[PDB]
Design an enzyme around this catalytic site. Structure first.
Site, mmCIF file in Angstrom:
data_model
loop_
_atom_site.group_PDB
_atom_site.id
_atom_site.type_symbol
_atom_site.label_atom_id
_atom_site.label_comp_id
_atom_site.label_asym_id
_atom_site.label_seq_id
_atom_site.Cartn_x
_atom_site.Cartn_y
_atom_site.Cartn_z
ATOM 1 N N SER A 77 -4.260 -4.808 1.126
ATOM 2 C CA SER A 77 -5.703 -4.791 1.367
ATOM 3 C C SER A 77 -6.430 -3.799 0.431
ATOM 4 O O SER A 77 -6.316 -3.959 -0.784
ATOM 5 C CB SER A 77 -6.010 -4.572 2.846
ATOM 6 N N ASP A 181 -5.797 -15.919 6.561
ATOM 7 C CA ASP A 181 -6.575 -14.707 6.318
ATOM 8 C C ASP A 181 -7.906 -15.085 5.689
ATOM 9 O O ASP A 181 -7.970 -15.992 4.856
ATOM 10 C CB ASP A 181 -5.805 -13.716 5.425
ATOM 11 C CG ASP A 181 -6.453 -12.347 5.240
ATOM 12 O OD1 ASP A 181 -7.386 -12.018 5.999
ATOM 13 O OD2 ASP A 181 -6.011 -11.600 4.345
ATOM 14 N N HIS A 209 -4.228 -11.622 8.201
ATOM 15 C CA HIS A 209 -4.350 -10.380 7.462
ATOM 16 C C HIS A 209 -3.132 -9.490 7.686
ATOM 17 O O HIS A 209 -2.765 -8.730 6.793
ATOM 18 C CB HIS A 209 -5.620 -9.653 7.892
ATOM 19 C CG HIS A 209 -6.038 -8.590 6.927
ATOM 20 N ND1 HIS A 209 -6.219 -8.867 5.586
ATOM 21 C CD2 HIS A 209 -6.315 -7.302 7.161
ATOM 22 C CE1 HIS A 209 -6.580 -7.721 5.053
ATOM 23 N NE2 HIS A 209 -6.663 -6.752 5.930
#
Length: 233
Positions: A77, A181, A209
């Protein structure tokens, strides 16, 4: 022997990736990067941004590995942009970066929420205006405000982050995405191929995610395999 740097997500600690590393079990050294946070809760941060924090991480991580042998970077991320930026600083010092492994992180300039101009205080009202919401419910000073800043600040850093097209890595990039995601998708993770002069591979995993947890031995195997193969000598 190769040293792989692990960069966590926005509110992520190095204790979150203990199980991720465990699983490595190999001829690979694992160093978990911890972001200078520790109660540093800061809204509208003049000081904080992606290349500024990447400069700090680099100053902290430069002594950990001698300017000779292996270094690989993994970022999940927000850590994906941080690992890319620190990997650029390592390459601009001739550290021989093996590869760059990006997970659930959009390519630079392929973030849609460019709310960089939006002030932190200003942003919450914008969040409040979209939906049917009592102005008091989120805007009021009762913590909602204090709990929000660690995430709010991250949003502004990501939104404000831009990398020039010619600033590229001289190592292969390996992208990993969770098919369910929406913070990052296969489509916005795909232009990472314009961030390298070498190879590029995108692998789609079933999950969202936080698929990382659901696909732990498969993901670490790919990272491990690719690390060793480039470095092998």
């Amino acid at each position: 022997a190769p040293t792989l740097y692990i960069f966590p997500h926005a509110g992520g600690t190095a204790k979150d990736y203990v199980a991720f590393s465990r699983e490595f079990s190999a001829d690979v050294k694992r160093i978990a990067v911890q972001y200078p946070g520790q109660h540093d809760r800061s809204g509208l941060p003049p000081l904080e941004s992606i290349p500024t924090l990447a400069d700090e991480i680099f100053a902290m991580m430069k002594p950990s590995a001698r300017i000779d042998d292996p270094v690989a970077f993994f970022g999940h991320s927000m850590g994906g942009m941080l690992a890319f930026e620190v990997a650029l600083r390592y390459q601009s010092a001739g550290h021989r970066v093996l590869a760059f492994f990006v997970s659930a992180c959009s390519a630079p300039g392929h973030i849609r929420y460019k709310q960089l101009q939006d002030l932190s205080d200003r942003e919450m009202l914008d969040l409040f205006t979209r939906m049917t919401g009592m102005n008091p419910d989120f805007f009021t000073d009762d913590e909602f405000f204090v709990g929000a800043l660690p995430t709010l600040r991250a949003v502004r850093a990501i939104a404000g982050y831009s990398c020039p097209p010619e600033t590229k890595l001289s190592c292969p990039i390996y992208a990993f995405i969770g098919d369910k995601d929406w913070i990052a998708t296969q489509d916005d993770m795909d232009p990472w191929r314009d961030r390298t002069t070498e190879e590029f591979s995108i692998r789609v995993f079933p999950g969202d995610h936080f698929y990382l947890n659901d696909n732990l031995p498969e993901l670490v195997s790919d990272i491990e395999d690719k690390t060793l193969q480039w470095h092998d000598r």
